Amino acid sequence: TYVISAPKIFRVGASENIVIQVYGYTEAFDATISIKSYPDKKFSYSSGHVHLSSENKFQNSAILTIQPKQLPGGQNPVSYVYLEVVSKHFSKSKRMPITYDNGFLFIHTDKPVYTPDQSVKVRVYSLNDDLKPAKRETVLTFIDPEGSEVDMVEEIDHIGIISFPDFKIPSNPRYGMWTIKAKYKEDFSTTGTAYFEVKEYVLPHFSVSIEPEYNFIGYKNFKNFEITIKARYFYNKVVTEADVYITFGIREDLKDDQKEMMQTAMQNTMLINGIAQVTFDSETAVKELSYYSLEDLNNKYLYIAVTVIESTGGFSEEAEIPGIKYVLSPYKLNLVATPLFLKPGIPYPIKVQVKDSLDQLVGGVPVTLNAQTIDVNQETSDLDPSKSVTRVDDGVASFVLNLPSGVTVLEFNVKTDAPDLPEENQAREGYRAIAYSSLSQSYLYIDWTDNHKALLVGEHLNIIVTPKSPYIDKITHYNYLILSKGKIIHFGTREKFSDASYQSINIPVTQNMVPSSRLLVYYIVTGEQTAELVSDSVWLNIEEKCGNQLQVHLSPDADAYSPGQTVSLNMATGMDSWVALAAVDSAVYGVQRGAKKPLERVFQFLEKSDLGCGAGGGLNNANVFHLAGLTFLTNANADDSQENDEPCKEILLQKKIEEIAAKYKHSVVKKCCYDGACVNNDETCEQRAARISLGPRCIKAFTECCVVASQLRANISGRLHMKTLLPVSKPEIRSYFPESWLWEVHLVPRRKQLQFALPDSLTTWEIQGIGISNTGICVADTVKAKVFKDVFLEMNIPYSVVRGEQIQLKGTVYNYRTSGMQFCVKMSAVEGICTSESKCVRQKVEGSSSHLVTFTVLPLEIGLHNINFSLETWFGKEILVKTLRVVPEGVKRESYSGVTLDPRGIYGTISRRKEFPYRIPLDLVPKTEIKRILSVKGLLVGEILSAVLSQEGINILTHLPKGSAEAELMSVVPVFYVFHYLETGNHWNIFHSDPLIEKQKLKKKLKEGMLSIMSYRNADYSYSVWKGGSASTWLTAFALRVLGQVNKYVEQNQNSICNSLLWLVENYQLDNGSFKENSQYQPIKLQGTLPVEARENSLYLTAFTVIGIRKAFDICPLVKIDTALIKADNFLLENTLPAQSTFTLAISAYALSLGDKTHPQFRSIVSALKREALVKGNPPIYRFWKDNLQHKDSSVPNTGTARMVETTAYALLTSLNLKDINYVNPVIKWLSEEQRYGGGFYSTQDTINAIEGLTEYSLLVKQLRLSMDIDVSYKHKGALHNYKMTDKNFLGRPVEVLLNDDLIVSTGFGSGLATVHVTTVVHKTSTSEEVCSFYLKIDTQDIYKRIVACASYKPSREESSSGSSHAVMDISLPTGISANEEDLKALVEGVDQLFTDYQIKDGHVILQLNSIPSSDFLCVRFRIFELFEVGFLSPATFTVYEYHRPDKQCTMFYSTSNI
Amino acid sequence: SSETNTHLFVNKVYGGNLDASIDSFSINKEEVSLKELDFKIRQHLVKNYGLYKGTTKYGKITINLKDGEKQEIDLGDKLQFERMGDVLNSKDINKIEVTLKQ
């Protein structure tokens, strides 16, 4: 009879191996196989004419192969096939499932944790079923920590190392666990996954560690564990008093970002002299505290996290421990290479194998084996306890029970009988074996022996083939089969040894079985009744010898490097190969870098292509062939494979408050209560309960739980500070982790050296390099290589220093040599800095530590920098150079000088000489020069060009605070317009460079800016103002708007935008087509009565949402949203015209403008607005509208406005829609002299519209070939530069006016258009002059020292009582006066959110929030700790202005000391 | 610089025994000299399937090229010096196949 083996499944693009071997007689005979489609044996993908004969002992192989036929998505194609063979004597074939699982995807993220703004290096290795390069096109698809796509991209497979492009982390991303997936572009279901976590970097004030008694928790301590927590400052001095807060938790694993804490986790034992301690009866703290009341019932983890806020400074530091795996019994049995079907009469081989909690083998341990069995006679049997002990070299406790052939199923229990362990805590298992039933009474058992746990390649396998039992021995031939990686690769026949029973078979282990292997072995039994096949098989772990030996060696093999040393690196391979270097900061992994395995990590996964399963061998020759990962093609026996195919899987006083979690009915209410009480003593509990929005559902859970915690601080105890910790589950991490390197790929024909110097930096580099070629994939052994300098000083210079203040320049010199030593730091006296030398003050450093250093100074030269520092040691002398920023007091910049150069009197007159003079404000801060810039560019759209093509990295065009989402959108604007300009007006030819590439860079600059916002994108696709904030309908559009605009050149995600529209409409569009704003967000302050304003405020929103839905409309053209679009425009006509304000009108204008521009009514509206304009010089040279509306106070006091220019944009845009070309020429003459050097000065909302104009219009009109011939010059001083402008240079350099003269820009004749801006900056001493729009009070209290600054809005006439719109608070901090980082987070991070965004940047505390109501003040409070000793200090500056109208700047000096 | 991954079958003939392995070669060109073709075939057998180490040395390598062409190179002797000029087409070959006598 005949055998034809083949997998248990098929794959596409799979070199399916198919052997044929046969008991045919002398007559040699032909054999062609092939692969045909379900019921009609019509399609035949391939075949093979493999002729057998007595010379080939009747056997042969064939590489068939189902390529990509059926491609109709949706149709359930390909599911099932017919495999077909042919010959002279017969022909046969079969149906057997198949799939689209060809190869694998490896996503080598560079490092597996990132902090804001890093670039995630990443690539991908990809193999086919045959573990060869597998060239193809693939795509991944990053997926933010909540599970919503965020990007995508494909690429070309030239070698197999698919080289994707850096993914940059958001300036402010969503905190948690990212997911990178990967899929083949074309056909193939093959799944790549990988991961990476983003955590929020924080700055460490002092290092808090935390070491646990042991590393698990074995039954010895279960009522106790000794944890020691050790805090200490960086200047080699432990903390003394500090408050200690330690939580604990359960958890499941280390891949779970969430772990269900425990209550009654001990607060406070006061860190005491660089330590304290406790001991943690595990019993108690879990039973009632979660689903675990039982020791036993725990084999999962124990998570630890402390917080140690220092007592002296008021700082805070946090530190955590992932987990601490509990254990029952410190050993863990696991059967080994021991199949669970006992053939009969043979003795059964039971090889258990003990290990410890850390997964090494552990020998010399007792192993009692109680068993039980039942006759075929359905008679039971209780065996007798065998006991071995585990080998010393083996870890194996070998057993053997000889079994009464009539046995059946064999159940048995193993267990250690360690003599010292509680019985309780003795590791154990249980299993089951079963008789390969076979009616011919015929069985098989094959074995072999080797003393080593693996069978190196090259060795040889002696396997004994004992057919024991078969009523008879009439055996012709033994026949074997060896699969490996789901592929047969060996098979043959050994003629049976006539006389005697068994006999040896000897198969050379081949490299081709590298990772693992099984084999099986059948003899064809001719029972008188029927042809009976019979077999068995084994699983065969072997040595993970790679294909190409890739090794990397460091030229200097020293175990430490000089930071910057040039050092050669070596590659090597027995065969030509593709390497892939990757130098991580080994820090990442690190703290117990789990044993697991390095190259095995891959080898594990990588061989789940083992189709079969088990220790080996089945239950029927069928079953045996099944578990083999085969099914075979033979008429004689049932080559079946029951039903499906076996999903095989691994056989082979703050507690008194936390009770009231009893009011759970939603998470957020838990948040209503938790932070609820938090720690607020500056305002009652129903005062904080006012500011509460989200819902009255929680207000109860607030004031209930605050009162409870407030009566409490009157009883626990001038130091008192309640708490109840919970990092809100936020990923923070007190350590940076440098961008890696050596990420290049390489071609290495056995040898390749590439020298290079290592980066100056303190770290230990783990340069790991994977390489791949025609053998497959193989990891090289890593090669750590810490670089580091013995001793070295650092100097902590400040950001800035006011002239004349006395500063204390700190720092600390580092000793890391074993013994101590002598140093000598001296500061270089630079011109204008003051000091104490007219010097070598040698000191001593205890070994392996640090001696603080200090130098005092005081600068009189503002801006003066440079200070060279130097230390001396027996064997060294080093010079670290530093630089000091020197400032004055009261910065104001007044830039209103500006011209347009118009030689050709193209816009209203000829302009060939404007004059910016000297105007020293009588408030000048003496002896400080007036610094001023002079921006000369061609085109009305040249300022907006230079901005985006002279710096890199997208960027905001005002000094406005990054807080909102808005702001994160204001980044994508300046480029988008500039690309819409460059492109749509095709002007790419501005560039002397290669332009096409210049394009890309802008393209990028766009997409990446585009992601910059994702973070603010909510779940239901509604966007939001500040992260997580209640979705704002207003900004839900404003993004819609700039989203659909940038869709022009950067395809945006359809179904994203889709739902994105369908949110506003379906939910926030009143029964009159108007749009209700969800959140409390006030973007803009509208004038008018409390009634008026409402109607006004409604119009505005409904105006803005339209614009949005419009701009973007085209990517989700939709019935259901076209509808709403009209319901909307309708409200607009039917409600605008009794005009309330010019501003109001103008958006309602511009918005109809983006629709049916012909509704008579629109004409009336357009009229009204058009009516309202005003203007400069007759005939009109400048046209523009005012904030008001015909109340004509006419106060245009020589000064622009955020809202002014916003409005006129809105009309200039309407006009530029209606192509009113001559109405407009004066409107932009004045935009283009408003705009402030760089970008659109006043606020945001204007400067995007304002920019949309100035482009749209330079798009619509026609450009005026430039050819001026400028000359800037001092009125009296000789001439400064002068340069022929053209279309060659026009975004020319800026220039600061040095000397003291009146200036004069003054082109000759020429042509085109030059926007001369000149932004002059000066420091003044008084605000007494200026306009207060905000009432304030700021003063420094002592109840150590803390700032309480206040404000109330000053309502302008006509304005509503409600007070301010979206507004910021800006506090400058006196030179060196850090503020209470934790203080602010308190204010914002809650449902009593008084503010909504804080951020300490370069010396300033910057708070955002929605309003500054005028009923009373609104006051912030935070505390501060002089980070050093500052001389006579020049006060800082508390300023407060309204985000949308920068016009409201009430600025005020103050000083943080009464001295 | 074509890089085809061909598959050749190995079969050792220990008399009424045959241990047969299926496996691959790597042709790194579009056309190769039967010399290089031959130096590569034995090179591997020599480094992988036990050739020239013991009773191994006598056999016949059978290159497949088309639906009717079958040729060999005696492993009993490298005396093939005139045909070593012969040149072969890369994407032509269909399936290599060896048979061993010890």
Ligand SMILES: *[C@@H]1O[C@H](CO)[C@@H](O[C@@H]2O[C@H](CO)[C@@H](O)[C@H](O)[C@H]2NC(C)=O)[C@H](O)[C@H]1NC(C)=O
């Ligand atoms: C500290 O600063 C001084 C002045 O800035 C540095 O002086 C220079 O040394 C380099 C190296 O020879 C010269 O090329 C420069 O011309 C020097 N600058 C001037 C204008 O004096 C000095 O190098 C720094 N200290 C050290 C030793 O690094």
Ligand SMILES: *[C@@H]1O[C@H](CO)[C@@H](O)[C@H](O)[C@H]1NC(C)=O
């Ligand atoms: C707080 O008040 C309780 C009840 O009146 C009193 O008994 C207790 O002494 C106070 N707390 C402490 C420890 O002083």
